[PDB]
């Protein structure tokens, strides 16, 4: 049908004239740091990428993309599923069932970490974080599993997608551009391309578009793929607003523009000035590198004898005729060096590398004083804080849905939500701290006055551990007092009759021969 | 912190559990009064101990009691060996041992 | 001094340590060289592409070729592999919950603390799985 | 390669002067061609029947450009793999390699789309080495006039 | 043979390659068990006692 | 209600009785305005420094028709004291502004 917005190949073309501000920023912004990261895409093989004269942008990007990956995504359990605790108390008989629910929540949070690591999501997120530094603005598509086989996720680094969003935060429509070759197309698309007509080469590429527009009269998204034809008839997906496999990530958020900025465009002016110094210092060393022999032409020394002489010949002439053209700028090389060492000093804090070689340095700064490296962690804490909303939560809310449909996860009952805690964490340390406070009460087990039954509740109240699996309740002890007794009942009892039977089993020796026959032993002993 | 500090002050009173003169029932209240922890879940009240003195006794009552009859039954359950075969049938054991 | 500055900014790009080619002049000592971990993190960005390209297809071929020559048992269609840099997570999360349970050792005679539950909470906080973790109902 | 027993089985590599792959702007591989230069006495047994089957005697040490072709199949997602000589095939050829498990895997330092091959890591500083040699060439030559 | 390979005037590239190829080999491929096989844990609970 | 409304306006340093609040870093915005005007000048002093001008003494012998076209190590006519380079001055002034 007309499908209320048309056409998807032209929605990409109307809004391609909106990437061109951000795209020509990133082509400039990758030129100074690392040119292989975001090409101009009027680029082929060959177009060799000249290294920038400065190597701080190449340094301070890998040292910032990895320190985001190490901080956003540690190897352990970076998400956790909080059940709403008061609504968990109502629907359940306390207290054993409550932690039994949290074992099912500890079940799921390990399966996702066994799903993320076993599908190389760590790879394509690190390729995402390098795009988020240089350009921002990457959407990565999480396809349906269709089995327990290998399932990566494809990203699109702003030269292959288009989104359009509001001045308000929500997304209106997305267009992604593939260039899948004809032999490599999926099966339903090859029926549509052949259904369009005309034979194709095995290696000819096809601009395959998607269109993920927000629906008329319903809050969910509609998603249809297309070719040069209208649709592909495997198209329509009813993606809800909160769970769509296409999520556009965003380095630093700015309203109400459609895309996001990047982090390293906020220092791209400063790299532009630091390369212009480092271009000049190197070129001053190249005039230096040339060795010109200035012969004083009012002198005696002809170098017709200086060249053709051997290892140690005696030659005519004065030494003060032969001087060499040397590069001047002794007091000028230090001006351009001390500024370039000051600009690298104030970019090395902007990026998360430590203070390092590029000074005298001269540390004596020792030894507990380098806890001010935590100032780099706090400055790092301001960097990804936007990104934990934009990437880190929608990547879980998609995988909580897609694993329900493929039955690789239990259907969690509509009430559990997740924070991206940088990981408990709070459940471990608050349990570990109240143990040591209760361990100080160990010499008070014989004190007749202190209510140790209450102090252990007060520390469990001061430290915010919950309660009610925390202490033995009213009944709960007559069972426990019996178990020490039933132990000593079974212990003294089994030691009684075994001494009781075997003493009288072998006395008045005819009974000893009768006792051995019951086991089946003949008269051996 | 106010709970953690009053523990260490009460922990210094540990070698005074046998001193017949110092009112350790009062010093633990004074430190609970000096440090602003509240009170009244803080100490064992008047009754509160005859229950507690019974629980050490009911423990030793259940412990020595369960060790008595288990030594008491099983000694006389297997003597004059016809009683031993009768005792194994009550569990359901035939003549295996 | 330029050639000592270009070698200085290639020696961080490659994973060798800062070295001879200056005055050097370390006094930089002794716990301060934990910033050599910055070279490991820069190294962590290098092979991260390569673990998808080399390190996973080399296993998925050998998981097939050893089935055909019967040098491996036919694993039942549901096991997949990460290239964890190696457990690892199974060892450290087991080693950490032992030391937390070892602090509960002077509480074996305390009549109030539910030690049957605290050992489950630490097994719940640390993401060790459960159910081989504790003695069940009969079991005693 | 396939084991064919518990004997010694290394793996052969090809450092870009002995293979050719062609892949899409999309990540997947379309076709691969590997070039061997196996000598005539050192050829495998089925290939010697094809070279003699082509005709003409060969020297014991003459090399033969032995090609493979690992193209993605028409109408099926698996790969097809056939070896060849100057002749058409070798009749020990056809292997139904699946998409996820093929013994020929092309490795790739830093990935760039949608070019067929990958770049290298040390070409990202090859300009800077080019400037650092031009200094170190001059310092040494200043010591030789010295 | 012969075409003798002249050494570059600088020896950082010869240094920084072996010191980077080995530190990839030591990090990608340690001597112990660098892969492991994860079974899908919830589907392992269903098919098993 | 007055005490519970979902729209709450936050306020860095409170000042009465104006409708809005000030900001913290406007209390040093004058000082940043002076510190950029120094750091703008130090960088621009390094850019005159960056340009490499070869001042040939025109009362001398050295013609650079031989200085350019010479090879790696040629013997050329001339005195070294003719070729000097236009360098940025301000040795005792760069330290004042630094």
Curated annotation (Swiss-Prot), chain C:
Signal peptide (UniProt feature, chain positions): none
Subcellular location: Virion
Role description: Forms the portal vertex of the capsid. This portal plays critical roles in head assembly, genome packaging, neck/tail attachment, and genome ejection. The portal protein multimerizes as a single ring-shaped homododecamer arranged around a central channel.
Protein family according to the UniProt entry: Belongs to the podoviridae portal protein family.
Subunit structure, interactors included: Homododecamer. Interacts with major capsid protein. Interacts with the tail tube protein gp11. Interacts with the terminase large subunit. Interacts with the internal virion protein gp14.
Name of this chain's protein: Portal protein
Organism: Escherichia phage T7
């Amino acid at each position: 049908t007309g499908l209320a917005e048309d056409g998807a190949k032209s929605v990409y073309e109307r809004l391609k004239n909106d990437r061109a501000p951000y795209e020509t920023r990133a082509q400039n912004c990758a030129q100074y740091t690392i040119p292989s990261l975001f090409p101009k895409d009027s680029d082929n093989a060959s177009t060799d990428y000249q290294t920038p004269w400065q190597a701080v942008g190449a340094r301070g990007l890998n040292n910032l993309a990895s320190k985001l990956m190490l901080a956003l995504f540690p190897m352990q359990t970076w998400m956790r599923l909080t059940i709403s605790e008061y609504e968990a108390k109502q629907l359940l008989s306390d207290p054993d069932g409550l932690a039994k629910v949290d074992e099912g929540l500890s079940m799921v949070e390990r399966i996702i970490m066994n799903y993320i690591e076993s599908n190389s999501y760590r790879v394509t997120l690190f390729e995402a974080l390098k795009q988020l530094v240089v350009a921002g603005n990457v959407l990565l598509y999480l396809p349906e599993p269709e089995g327990s086989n290998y399932n990566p996720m494809k990203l699109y680094r702003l030269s292959s997608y288009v989104v359009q969003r509001d001045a308000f935060g929500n997304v209106l429509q997305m267009v992604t551009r593939d260039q899948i070759a004809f032999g490599a197309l999926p099966e339903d698309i090859r029926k549509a391309v052949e259904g369009q007509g005309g034979e194709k080469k095995a290696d000819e590429t096809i601009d395959v578009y998607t269109h993920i527009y927000l629906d008329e009269d319903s809050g969910e998204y509609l998603r249809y793929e297309e070719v040069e034809g209208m649709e592909v008839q495997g198209s329509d997906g009813t993606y809800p607003k909160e769970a769509c496999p296409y999520i556009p990530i965003r380095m630093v958020r700015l309203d109400g523009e459609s895309y996001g900025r990047s982090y390293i465009e906020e220092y791209l002016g400063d790299l532009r000035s630091l390369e212009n110094l480092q271009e000049a210092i190197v070129k001053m060393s190249m005039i230096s590198s040339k060795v010109i022999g200035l012969v004083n032409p009012a002198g005696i020394t002809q170098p017709r004898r200086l060249t053709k002489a051997q290892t140690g010949d005696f030659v005519t002439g004065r030494p003060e005729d032969i001087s060499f053209l040397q590069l001047e700028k002794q007091a000028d090389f230090t001006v351009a060096k001390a500024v370039s060492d000051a600009i690298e000093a104030r970019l090395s804090f902007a990026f998360m590398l430590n203070s390092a070689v590029q000074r005298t340095g001269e540390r004596v700064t020792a030894e507990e004083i380098r806890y001010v490296a935590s100032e780099l962690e706090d400055t790092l804490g301001g960097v990804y804080s936007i990104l934990s909303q934009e990437l880190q939560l929608p990547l879980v809310r998609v995988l909580l849905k897609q694993l329900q449909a493929t039955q690789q996860i239990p259907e969690l009952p509509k009430e559990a939500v997740e924070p991206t805690i940088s990981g408990r964490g709070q459940d471990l340390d608050k349990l570990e701290r109240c143990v040591t406070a209760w361990a100080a009460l160990a010499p008070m087990r014989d004190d007749p006055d202190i209510n140790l039954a209450m102090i252990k509740l007060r520390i469990a109240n001061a430290i915010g551990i919950d309660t009610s699996g925390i202490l033995l309740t009213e009944e709960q002890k007559q069972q426990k007092m019996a178990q020490q007794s039933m132990q000593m009942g079974m212990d003294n009892g089994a030691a009684a009759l075994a001494q009781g039977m075997a003493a009288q089993a072998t006395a008045s020796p005819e009974a000893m021969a009768a006792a051995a026959d019951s086991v089946g032993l003949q008269p051996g002993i």
